[model samples]
Every structure is written in structure tokens, then in C-alpha cells.
Target: EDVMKRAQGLFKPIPAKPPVMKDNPASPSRVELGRMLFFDPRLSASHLISCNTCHNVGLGGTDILETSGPRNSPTVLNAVYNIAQFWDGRAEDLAAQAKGPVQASVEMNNKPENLVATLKSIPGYPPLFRKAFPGQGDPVTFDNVAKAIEVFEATLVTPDAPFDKYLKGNRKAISSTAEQGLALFLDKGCAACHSGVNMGGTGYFPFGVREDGRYKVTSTAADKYVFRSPSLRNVAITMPYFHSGKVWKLKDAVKIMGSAQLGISITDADADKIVTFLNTLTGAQPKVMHPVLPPNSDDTPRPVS
Candidate 1:
């Protein structure tokens, strides 16, 4: 279709895999270490929360809560390509973002030192850390926790969406209705910001340039409503929308986005079309191997709570 060809110019498909890091290379050993940490709840002071608790891999890498804990939990799917992590771009990379939740007051609420000590006490973990970070003086430090998680997060890209199929010269990969929606997405200028691999994760933008907010991470007027645009990959499954997570319906969120972000109005019919197109973004989710994490033996530090 003509629309598909035009779309080829405007939007890039999600990559089959995430990007690599210069220092923290991807190896089976390193990625496995990260995977163990991501699913382990003992990382939290409460012993109740894990990275997977909020960004549950089964739940499209997000918390079930409306708006989610502390901040709206964005998808870890394809997060490796993110220009920066978190709505406020607070963390520079996935490694840095990995360090955040274990100590946040509302979430994991554990100290990095405590996590380091706990991991050190686990007899099974020492050898894994050694293999993952060979030649390091202190392999089981908190920094390695973040580093391992980063590499693991890198492997979480969801590929083979209908949209991606369409991108690869398979015009009929999506339906005729979906093609119409794609035309509208580019025609209405949504592609100006929402294009590229991981569509919308490539840059930072103010949350409501389509919108406002209560939470003030930066404490400045300019920072009040600013945020990085979340990726639309698996977006249909990862509802309620927005930083507030208040928008439950994707159709309404589409219209709200026009008014608040793009400064335009989209019809209900048009909004429905856009939603259909977005659904095409939902690809094969990663089947993360949920490792049975090491037990927090009595000798280890107990949960603070």
C-alpha cells in the first residue's frame, strides 16, 4: 500500500534485539546474573518487593497499580534503547536505573550496602558474580548488581509485531483498517515524535505539552510536567496510560494526547483507528526465565520491615 511505503520513511521498526554497552558486554554469565537479581524480592527492605514486583515481566514490565508505585512503572521491554530511564530522565542508562528501585522509599526501600552484604553472604552467588565480572577486585558489589541487571534488561526486546512485519515490506502484515490508521498517524504528525525503534523512547519530552502534575522530582517550575515519552511497544497491554496512569482507555488517551501533547483534536473515529494501529505494536513478549533466587538464610540480613 502507498501508506506503508510512506510509513517506511517516517517510522523505524523495533529492533530484533537491544543495543550493547561498551564496558558491560553481554554474555550468558552476566545476563544470567542480572536475571537472578531482577526477580529476587529479597533485594527490598520489605522482602515483599522485587524489580519484578513493579516491572513484572509477565505484566509487560509494569506494576499493576494505577500510575504504579512511586512513579509510573514503564516497560522494561526494549528499554535498552531508551535515551534515558524514568519519566524525568533521572538515570542515564539501564545500569543506573537498575540501582534506583532497591533503595527507593516507596518501592524496594533497601540500602545498597545491605544488598551487597546480603549477596555476599549467599554462598551460591559469589561464583556467579565471579564468572560474570572476571578480573574485578570486588565482583559482588552493588555496582555489579546494577551492571548485571542492565545487560539482562538489554535482552528484553519484543520483536515480530504486525507493525514490524509491515515495516519489512510485508504490506498485508497488518489489516486494511490498520493501514488507514498508520496513514493518519503520520499524516496527523504524530510521527514527528513517536517514530523510531521503540517508538517514543528515543527522546525526552514534556508529559503534557499535550498536559500538569503533583509529583515534583526536580522542584522547579520547568520540571513540574516534564518526562521522557514512553515506548509504545506492548503499549496496548501496558495500560492505564500516562505518568499518572489515570487514563484507562487507550482511545481516550489518544484524544487526550492530541489536545495535551500535540495541541490538536482527534475524532473518536480517528482515535479508534489510532488505537488499532497501536495494538499492532504489541509483539512477542520475552519469556524471561524466572530463576528460583537464592534463599535469604537466617545468617543474612533480615528485612528491615
Candidate 2:
């Protein structure tokens, strides 16, 4: 009872669906186009490594490939609920966030001009883009690519976990041990940064409070080690935790956070309890069917290494 009472203000449940983007509203055509783009590796210079390459929808929205990029691919699930995108929190929203990886030399490795040329060569995309962005004379722009992906990415929210049921007044939804774990999670200060509908996507904090993750973005001394807190939804399955993506066990991550962020040493038992509570955060993952990509035409530029 006290646990629920304490969690009343500290945490909230994720809704079944994400809120609509005001600037880039979703239409059936746009979402479908986005889905295709998300899965199509043709956007990359190598004709490999799509948005779904690292952020696979089937694998809890993350991939295990260490060489995929510098940082761990944060799960795309429920990302619309985040305060900002990426570990550094550089991009303001999903549309802006979508634009980054496509041009990154380490990621998609395609210039916007080249990407536009590549898309135009496909023959199938211009018509689809036109349908997705009706009334625009030339809708196959690079920005529109991000816009379409944003609407589709916004659909990838996970919801209705055991925690949600508990929050909705189904007290018996989670085990009593998990309830104790929840209490420990709150009392031990884990909830300070990790509280919200998405749990931990709410704000930026120093990776090591005692830490310079954001200094690269701001160049201010205070921002050194500062990074946006990651969403813990479906965290039980989104393994290889943190921005570094090195830690494999949830309990180890809990211990690290206790020492690094909270400055307290989390005991093994405590970590177990806390992890049990964190497991309650797992929600129903979205069912995103893979799209059938249109065949590339002879005019399409050949992929480069």
C-alpha cells in the first residue's frame, strides 16, 4: 500500500499509443512510406545498414552489433515519449533525430544530395513520396524522408506492462517481491531520474554525478558527463545497457548506477529486488510488419564500400 502510495507521484504508466506529432501528422500513406524507408538499406551508400539495422523492431528495438556505431543503439520503442533523442540529447524530436544517422560516415554513410539522387533513381519512391506528401511538387526531399520515418517511429510505443496494470489499480498484477523491489527502487533514489510514463526518459543528468557526456554538445564545464536518461521501457529485454552498451546484466547496471549516479553502493540483494521491479517496466512491444521494398532500377547508383 505504501509502495503504491509512494509511486503515485513518482511514476506513471505508459499509454497504449504515443501522442501524435503536431508538425508531422501521420497519414496512412506517410506511415507506410516511413515503414518502407525504415527497413530499406538502399538509403545507405553501402546498400546496407538501415535504420532498423541497429534499432531492430523485433529485437526489443535494439541490435547487438558492437561495430554498428560508437554508442549503443537506444531502443526505438517508446522513443516519442523521450525528452530528446540520442544519448547526448542533441536532436529535439524524432523527425530531427531521424536525419542524423543517414549522413553519418560511421552509420548510413550517404550525403543528403546523394541520398536524394539515390531515392530519385529508384523510380518507385518518387510516386510513394508524392502520395505520402500530397500537393508538394517535389516531395522526395531528404527532409521528407525524416518526416515519414518520424511518424512511423512514433508508432513504436510499448504499453500495458504488469506495471501499468498495477498502476491502473490492479494491485495483484505484480508479485509482492516485485512490489518490494519497487519500494527499494524508489527509496534507494533510482526513481529520481528513472520516473515517468517511459521511466528514465524524462531528463538529463550527469552520467556520473560525481561525470561529461553532454560537454561535447554544450562545451560548458557543467555539461561534462551529462547525458539524457534513457527510457527503461522493455528494459528487461533491451540488454547490453547504458550508452557504452557493455554491461550485459541488469543487476550490474543497477550497481553501477548506484555508485556512479546515486553515490550509494547497491547490495546484491538490493540489486536483485530493484531489477525485479525494473522487470515490471516491460511492456507490450509493437507489431511492425516488415515492408516489401521496391526493386531498384538500372538507373539506381551502385552501392559503394
Candidate 3:
């Protein structure tokens, strides 16, 4: 009763589906085209780094790399619900967020000109673009590319977590330990940052507030140690946590956050309860069959060095 009362006030259940935007209509054709582009590595300079490369769908939507570029790659799963994309919250929305990686010297490492050239080179994409945007005079531009990809990414949602079932009045949906953890999660103030549907995607908090994480998007003193509070959905599997990505064990991350962010030493037992609750956030992963990529024609531009 206390948990329900507190939880109802402090946190809300995840929506079964992501909210659709007017600007980027989530048409089936749009989603399908986006799905293709998301998987096609040709968007990269090396034909190796696709969106799916870092946010691998099957691998809890994250890959472990010693040099995985900037902040740890957060899962794109349910990313449509995030307040903004990326750790610094630089990108305004998913479509805006999608435009960056293709030319992000470290990520996709290719220019928009080259990517547009690559897409134009694919014979199959032209028809798909027309299909995705029925009346657009020319549908294969880079911004349209990002929009279609965002439309498809909107479909990459995880639902039906144990917590969701519990919120929907299913008592046994979560374990007793998890129920205890949930209480601590709220009581200990974890919910302050990790609130909302995707849980922690809505806000930015300074990491290691008592200390510093060396995080800064803008050189301002206020920006120091600041980063997005990542969603804990599927967090049990999206291991090696934080912007740094060095920490692997979820338990350690919990303890670190307690000391660093909350200014309290989370006991192992307390952290374990928190961990148990966090595990219940794991939901049904999207079953996406990788799209069959179109072959590159002779005119297709080659990879950049």
C-alpha cells in the first residue's frame, strides 16, 4: 500500500507505445525505410559502423568497445520517449539526433554529401523514399533520411515489464525482493532522476556531484560533471554503465551512484535490493528482423579512410 501510494506519486507506468509526433509521421513505409537505413552500414565512411553497430538491437541495444567514442552508447530502445537525445542533451529530437552520427568523425565518419550519394547510389532506396513520403517532390534528402529513421526508431519500444504489470494491478508481477527494492528506490531518492516512462531519460543530473565525472559539453562551470540520467529500462542487460562505460557490474554502478550522486553510501544489501528492482524494468525486446540491404552499384561511392 505504501509502495503503491508512493510509486503512484513519484513514478508513472511506461506507456505501452511511444508517443507519435506530428512532424515525423510514423507511417509503415517510413518505418521500414528507416529500419533499412538504420541497419545499412553504408551510411558510414567504412561501411562498418551503422546505427545498429553501437545500439545493437539484440545485445540490449548497446555494444562494449574500449573506444566506443564519447559517452557510453545508450540503447536506442524506447529512445523516442527521451526528453532529448544524447548525453549532453544537445539534439532536440530523434530526427535532429539522427542527422549527427553519419558525419560524426568518430561515429559514422562520413559527410552528408557522401551519405546522400551512397543512398542515391542504392537502386532500392529511391522507390522506398517515394513510398515513405508519398507527395514529397524529392524524398531522398539527408533530413528526410533522419526523419524516416526517427519514424522507424519510434517503433523500437519495449513494453510489458514486470513493473508495468504491477502498476496495472498484478501483485505477483515482481519478486518480493524487487518490491522491497522499489520502495528503497523511491525512499532513497533514486526516483528523483529516474522518473517517467523510460525512467531517467527525461533529465540531466551532474554525476559525482560530491566529486566530479569530468563531464562537460559546454566549458561553463555549470556544465561540469553534467550528463543525462540514462533510462534504467533493460538496465540489467545494458551493463558497463555510465558516460564513461568502464563500470560493468550493475551492482557497482548502484553503489557508485549512491556515493557519487546522492551523497550516501548504499549498503550492499540496500544496493542489492535496488538492483533487484532495476532488473524488473527489463521488458519485451523488440523482435526486429534485420532488413535485407540493397547491393551497392558501380556508382556507389566507396568508404572514406
Candidate 4:
């Protein structure tokens, strides 16, 4: 009872609220519209590549192909808490992030006007859009388009994982090996940057210096090879890890992270344990049902670019 009470306390009495859309509130109609847009390839120029192409749930919300995706698809499962979206922290919010793939010639390649026209022509969408934004002149405007998608994306939260259960005082939630790994993770200072509800820092950190690469993003020498720390949540599944996708296996990724990021050569046993613990971070897969679209329109083609 005591543990349960403490755990309850750990969870905010009120669940965190997702950001509100400027023109739309949370509603089934909006979510339904958003779902359609999320899966629709018409949003892109080539009529291929919906949001799910890169953020594939089957691949742990990422494209497993090494260096294929122009940018890493950060898991949407718990993305609401992120301060910024994308590896570069370029997009300030989900709404802003949605615009990128829509316009990127290499990705979706659809212009805003073209996308609006295509969406407006769909009979099922306009009514849903109207319900989400009653007074808006056109329901299929770019703003509302992004708003609807953002609303639906916010619902993709991961409910519970073994690691969360363990933190809540479920002693058996994780195995002994995982527990040892967790301890080593803390003792080795891996947690310094990774400690958070997201299990990834909310800021950027420089790579290579702590570990090789001289390539820098900024003109400053100190800023070279820096990138945002990705969440470790589904680490077992999102393989060919790291920014460059150089490391193929999870074990190899761990070794590189420990040596390069922390400047410590971890023992084989410790690395194995950490990997075991990381495996516990894997949560149950959420269902991403195929969406229905208007007649005569095929879902976006593959090879999003």
C-alpha cells in the first residue's frame, strides 16, 4: 500500500494535458480526420509516403534501414513531452514538424496549395474538418491540416512498460540482470544525460569529443558532431543505432555509447546487463489500423521520396 501510494504520488495527480490546437479542441471527428491525413499519401506530391512510412510502428516507430531516412523518426509513443521535435530540435511542436515532410521534395513533396486542394476535394474530410473548426472558412487549410494531425499524434502515448512498473516498486517487473544493468547505468553516469520521464535528455549534446568525428554543424570547433540524445524507449527494436546508423547490433551500440559518450570501456558483462535492462524498455505495440480514404485514391506510394 505504501509503495502504491508513493507510486501514485510519483504520477502527477492530474495527467499531463496535450497541447491544444489553436482552432480545434480534442474531438472524435478531428481525430478521425487526422487519422485519414496521417495515412493519406495524397498529402505528398508523388501520392506516396504518409507519416507512417518513416514512423513505422512495426519498426519501433523508426525506419530500421541504416541511413535511409533523411532524419531519424523519433517514436511518437511519448512524444508529447518533448520540448522540440526532430533530431535538430528544429520544429518547435508537432504542428510545426508536420509541415516539413509535407514540403520536403525528398519526402512528401506536396505544396501547401496542392495539399489543401486534394484534401478539400475529399467528401468525407470537409464535414469532419468543419466539426473540428466550426467557423473556419475552409476546413482544409494548412493550419487546420497540421492541427488535426497534431491532435491525433498526441494520442500515441505509450501506456506502461516494465521499466515504469519497476520504478513503481514492482520488484519482479524486471529481471535481476536488468536490475544490475540499471545500477551500472546509473553508476557509470549514463543516467546523467538520459534521466527523465522520456529516458532521454531534452537537450543537445556534442558527440565525438567525449568519445572521433571532426565534422561540426556550427562554425565553432567545440560544436562538432553534436546531436540530440534519442530516447532509449524501444532500444531493442530500433537497431542500426546512432546518428550515422554506424552500429548494427545493440551490443555494439552499447559498447560505442559507453566508450565514446562516457569515455569508459565497459566490461562485457556490464554491457550485456545494460542491454538487458534496455530491452525492458520495450513496451507493448500500439495498434495502427489502416485508414479509410475516399474512392479512386490509392494510399501514398512506398519510397516516401
Candidate 5:
């Protein structure tokens, strides 16, 4: 009962809100068009890989492998709230991040100019583009393409998780064991870095507190080994873990994360309980509708008209 009370103490729920966007350019039509573009593989030079291929919905909006992606694919759900996109904080917004995958050699391997042309050949897309971007000449332009997809991506947010319920004063939402774990999470200073609505999505931190590695992204030696702090939402589903994807089992990852990131060595039993609490962070998957393709599709190359 003490454990349950302790866990309940950590239950602070924030209201559900959409990610913030600049330019304020999201509408239903634009969001829909973006969703179609997101699912379409034709954006790739090989016509095989879509944005979903790497940032997969099944795998917590990330690729599930030890360094499978050249860089880690952050969660698309609630991404608009991020100050900047990518592990290195390279892209300023979703629009810039959307453009990166197509041109990346390890990913889509498509040039932007070619991608624009390919979309032009798709009969279904032009009319839809017109609806999304009225009076905009060549709605298939890269800017519009990025903007449309960004609109749709902004809608992805995980609400109504068990933790969320617990936050809402639901006594029976999570088990007593899970609640104990939650208490430990807060008492141990994990919340110092991992707090907030998206739970650790909105900040950057340096790696190598647990492991030995020099951070080289910044010019200063002290700045070595720093990386963005990833969100803990749906963490159970998104493995192998870490920026390098070094950890495998969820429990093991928790152990290491506690030791390295927080400088606290927790017992296996305590780690297990914490893992149970963390599991409640997993929420319902976003509804991704399948996109309609143009009929009479052929391999014939067409210029952007």
C-alpha cells in the first residue's frame, strides 16, 4: 500500500495538446495530402522505401535494429513540439526533416527534383494537391510537398495511456508494482530530465555519462558525447535501445539507462518494476490510412510538367 501511495505521488497528468507549428498552415485537406505522401514509396528513387519504412509505426516511429538507420529516427508522434528535428538537431522543422529522407543515400536515394517529377506523373496526386494548396502554381513543388506532410505528421500524439489515466486520478489504472516503480522514477531524479507531457521529448542531453565515449559534435571538449534526450513514450516497442542501439532487452536497457544517464545503479528487481511502470507509457497507435495510387502506373519516366 505504501508502494502504491508512493507511485501515485508521481502521477501528474498534463492535458492533451497537438504539437505547435509555425506559419499556422495545417488544414484537413493539407493533412490528408501529407498522409498520402507519407505512405507513398514513389518518393524514393527505387520506388520501394517510404518515410514509413524507417520511421515505422509498428516500431514506435523508429527502426528496430542496432544502428539500422544511419541516424536515429525520432518519433513522429508529437514531433512538432521539438525545438529542432533529428539526433544532431540539424533540421529546423518537420518540413526540412521530411526532405532529408528522400535525398539520403542510405534511405530513399531520390533527388528532390526527380521526386517532384515522379509525383507529377501520379494522376491522383495533382487534383488532391490543388485542393490542399489552392492557386499555388505547381503544388508538387518540394516546399508544398514538405509542408503537406508536416501538417499530417503534426497530428500524431499518444493520449489515453494507462499512465495518462493514472494521472487523471484513476486509482485502478495501473498496478501497485507499477506505481512503486513510478515513485522510484521520481525520487531517483529521473524526472529531472525526463519530465514533461511527451516525457523527455523536448530536450537535449549528452551521452557517455554511463559509457565511455567522447562527444565530437561540438567544438569544445566538454561538449563531447552529447546527444538529444529521446522521448520515453512507447519505449517498450522501440528497441534495440539507445542512440547507438546498443541495448537489447527492455529491462537491460532500463538498468543501463538508470546507471549511465542518472548515475544511479538500481537493483534488477527495482529495474523490473520501473520497466513495468514505463510500459504504461505505451499508448494506442496512430491511425494511418492507406494511400490511393494512380491507375495505369508504368515505369516510363516523366518530367515534372
Candidate 6:
């Protein structure tokens, strides 16, 4: 009963409906267009590498690929619930976040102007964009590209996990060992930063004390080493933990969190129980269809490299 009470106090269930952003309300056309763009490798300089390359929709919103150095690929599932995008919380919204990797030299390596031209050159894209963004003189702009992708990514939410069911009032939804782990999670101060609907994406804290990451963004002395606590939803499946992408096992990651953030060593037995509890966080993964990209027209620029 105490466990149920504490769980209720700490977390909320993922909403049945996907969150609707005011600036970019989702429509079927926009979502369809975004799905195509998300799967379209032509957005990248190599004509190969789409968003799905890193954030594979089937692999718990992470990828099997090892591109992009240092940081682990955070799950795109339920990212709409995050306070901000990226580990450092740099991009304020999903649309803003969408534009980052497309321009990064190591990621997509495409300029905004070039991207617009590429989209414009595709005969099939403009009409689709026109449907997605009506009343626009030219809907194939790069901003609209991100906006469309934002709408599609918004649909990528995971709900109805066993923990969510427990929170929603099913006493037998989780095992007692998981219940114990939940108690420990709250009592040990893990919930302080990892609380809320998405579990951890709601706040930022120092990586060790809870250096260089947030400092580059804000330049504030205290902000150094700070990172947004990643959402624990679907975390069991999105393995290779932490911003460093070093930790591969979730149980080991839990122990590290115990020692590093709370300043206490977690027992291996206790870590396993905690992991059992965390596994209940795995929710329904979005079944995104592989979009059939529009064939390139003669005007479409050839891949640079």
C-alpha cells in the first residue's frame, strides 16, 4: 500500500493521446510527409543516412549503428514528453532538435540551402508538402521539413507499460521485487531527478555530483558537467547507457547511478531488483512503416560523397 502511494506521488502515466504541440499541430498529411523525410536518406550528404540510421524505430528508438561519437542514441519514443531535446537540453523543442543532425558535418552534412534545393528538385515532395502545409507559397522549405518531421516524431510515443498500469491502479501489475525496487528508487533519492511521466527527462543535474557538456552551451560555471536526466521509459531495451555510451548493461548502469549520484554503493542483488522494476517501463513501441521515398529527378544533385 505504501509502495502504491509513493508510486502515485512520484509518477504519471503516459497519456493515451500523443501530445499536440501548439506551434506544430499534427495532421495526417504532415505526419505522412514527415515519415517519408525521416526515412529519406537524400536529406544527408552521402544520400545514405536517415534519422532511422541512428534512431531505429524497431530497436527501442535507438539504433544498431555505431555512428555519432560519445553520446548514446537517446530513444525518440516519448521524446515529446521531454523538457527539451538532446542530453544538454540545447534544442528547445522537437522541431528545433530535428534541424541539428541534418546540418552536423559528421551526421547528415547538408546545408539548409542545399536541403531546400534537394527537396525542390524532387518532383514528388512539393505536392506532398503543399498538402501538409496549406496556404504556403513554398512548402518545401527546410523549416517545414523539420516541422513535418516533428509532427511524425510526435507520434512516436510509448504508453501502457506495466508500471504505467500500476500507476493507473492495478495492484498486481508488477511483482513484489519490483515493488521493493520502486521503494528504493524513491527512498534513495533516485526519484528526485528521475520523477514525472517520462521518469527522467524532466530535469538536469551534474553528471557526477548529482564537466564539459553543458558548459559549451551556456558557459555558466555551475552548468558545467550538467546534463538532462534521460527518460527511463523503454530504457531497458535502449541499452548502452549514459551520455558516454560506455555502459552496456542496464543493471550496471543502475549501480553506477547509485554510486555516482547518491554516493552509495548498490548491492548487486538490489540492482537486479531495480532492473526488474525498470523493465516494467518498456511500453508499446510505435510501428512505423518504412516510407517509400520519392525517386530523384534529374535536377536532384548527386551525392557529394
Candidate that would win on lDDT: 6
Tens-digit per-residue lDDT, 1-305, candidate 1? 78878888866777776678779899999999999998887777777777887788898888756654345678888877766556654334532544353335223367788888889878889889999999987899877888899889888888899999999999889988888888888888787677677688666665442233322121222544456667787889888777767667777667666653355567888988998999998988898877977765668877775
TM-score of each: 0.87, 0.88, 0.88, 0.79, 0.80, 0.88
1-305: candidate 2 lDDT, tens digit per residue: 87897787877887775579989999999999989998988877888868888889989888965436367778888878887455654323432544354334323467778878988998889999999999999999988988898899889988788998998888899999999889888877778888777787777664531223222111222544457777888889988877767677777777666653354666788888888988988888888898988888999999898
Write down the lDDT of every candidate, Cα atoms only. 0.75, 0.77, 0.76, 0.64, 0.67, 0.78
lDDT-better candidate, 4 vs 5: 5
Model 2, runs deviating above 4 Å: 67-69, 89-108, 209-223
**lDDT for residue 215 in candidate 6, whole number 0-100:** 21
Model 6 per-residue lDDT tens digits across residues 1-305: 98898888989999878788789989999999989988888888778877887888989988843336356678878888887455654323432544353344223356778778988999999999999999999788877988898789889999899999999899789998888888878877788788888897887665531123112111222544457778899988988777756666777778777653345556888888889999999998888889888899998999986
Q: In model 2, which range of ten residues has the least summed lDDT?
A: 209-218
Off by over 4 Å in 5: 1-20, 89-108, 209-225, 295-305
Mind giving the per-residue lDDT tens digits that candidate 5 earns over 128-162?
A: 89999998777778778888888787777677889
The TM-score, computed over Cα atoms with residue i paired to residue i, of candidate 2 is 0.88
Least accurate stretch of 10 residues (summed lDDT) in model 5?
A: 212-221
> lDDT per residue, candidate 3, 98-165, as tens digits?
43533343333677877887898999889899999888888889888888888888888888989888
Query: Alpha carbon lDDT of residue 140, candidate 1?
Result: 96
Error of 5 at 292 (Å): 1.4
Comparing 1 with 6 on TM-score, the higher-scoring candidate is 6
